[PDB]
Design a binder for this molecule. Structure first.
Ligand code: CL
Ligand code: CL
Ligand code: NA
Ligand code: NA
Length: 129
């Protein structure tokens, strides 16, 4: 599924991301825009052989099991394919573990390079919330 901007903002709010670990909702919407263009089916392969999955591009080296990333962990205890569903619950629950691990949202390279330090509530501006 490809979300609209305000549709996704409202789904992330319902699932508890607004101000989670101090990150306002616009940060999460901005990260999803530049990681996946709001498409839950996005996949991208990395040089080390791992793959990134879903609307927040969660990586199989650490966070999910895809059966083809030897020596990797599965810290969210899920198959990576669960992160491609039109229901974003599995991606949100895993993202909450990632953002809690000490490095905050810097775990998402597109957030660091395209959202951090910008006017992020602009991403929610005008939505019903
Ligand atoms: Cl980037
Ligand atoms: Cl915001
Ligand atoms: Na893995
Ligand atoms: Na959803």
């Amino acid at each position: 599924k490809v979300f609209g901007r305000c549709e996704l903002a409202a789904a992330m709010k319902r699932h508890g991301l607004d101000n989670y670990r101090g990150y306002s909702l616009g940060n999460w919407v901005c990260a999803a825009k530049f990681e996946s263009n709001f498409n839950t089916q996005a996949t991208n392969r990395n040089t080390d052989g791992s793959t990134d999955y879903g609307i927040l591009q969660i990586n199989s080296r650490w966070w999910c099991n895809d059966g083809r990333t030897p020596g990797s962990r599965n810290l969210c205890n899920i198959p990576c394919s669960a992160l491609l569903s039109s229901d974003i619950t599995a991606s949100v629950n895993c993202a909450k573990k990632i953002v809690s691990d000490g490095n905050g949202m810097n775990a998402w390279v597109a957030w660091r390079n395209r959202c951090k330090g910008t006017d992020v509530q602009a991403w929610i501006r005008g939505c019903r919330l």
